[PDB]
């Protein structure tokens, strides 16, 4: 089962399977199964080939996989080219939302070095 995006999970719930793909998570996973009329507890095993294309159609509406990866990256690359506060804050490797860079910026800034 290819299931739209290149990620192919197996031997898990339908709620777990949809969360693994990029651009789709726990909230939308309920909406995709509720639209097609599929239960949360059913596994990928014991599921027909015609039943796959219904879930494949709904996930294909919203932008997912490599298209959404570049959608966020292009909005960053555009925002960096504007010459703004947030733009210079991306490229230099520091927190954009306005967190403290004095201490506890270890996520966005990166590991300690001499």
């Amino acid at each position: 089962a290819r299931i739209a995006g290149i990620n192919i999970p197996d031997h898990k719930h339908a709620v777990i399977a949809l969360t693994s793909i990029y651009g789709v998570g726990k909230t939308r996973s309920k909406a995709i199964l509720a639209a097609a009329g599929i239960a949360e507890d059913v596994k990928i095993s014991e599921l027909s080939e015609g039943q796959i294309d219904t879930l494949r159609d709904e996930v294909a509406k919203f932008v997912v996989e490599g298209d959404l990866r570049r959608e966020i990256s292009m909005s960053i690359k555009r925002l960096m080219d504007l010459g703004c506060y947030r733009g210079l804050r991306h490229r230099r490797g520091l927190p954009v939302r306005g967190q403290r860079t004095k201490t506890n910026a270890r996520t966005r800034k990166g590991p300690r070095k001499p």
């Binding site: 555009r78 504007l82 010459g83 703004c84 506060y85 947030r86 210079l88």
Partner: protein, 79 residues
């Protein structure tokens, strides 16, 4: 994101934008207010934003409508 319904701007700076259209653009205007937001009518008009020392020449562009004037003037000098 912020400001709810309607784009909040300053009154005095709106007259300077209408001056740039009606009387025509000449030079970059030195404005102390960072509170106003960029509009479509502000495209292709030179403006200048104060940030603790002197007004920086910030050129306005088509896609700058989505952000504020204050973002384009960094206050804290580094290096």
């Amino acid at each position: 994101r912020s400001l709810k319904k309607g784009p909040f701007i300053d009154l005095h700076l709106l007259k300077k934008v209408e001056k740039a259209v009606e009387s025509g653009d000449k030079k970059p205007l030195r404005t102390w207010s960072r509170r106003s937001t960029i509009f479509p009518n502000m495209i292709g008009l030179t403006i200048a934003v104060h940030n603790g020392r002197q007004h920086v020449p910030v050129f306005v562009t088509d896609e700058m409508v989505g952000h504020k004037l204050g973002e384009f003037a960094p206050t804290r000098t580094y290096r």
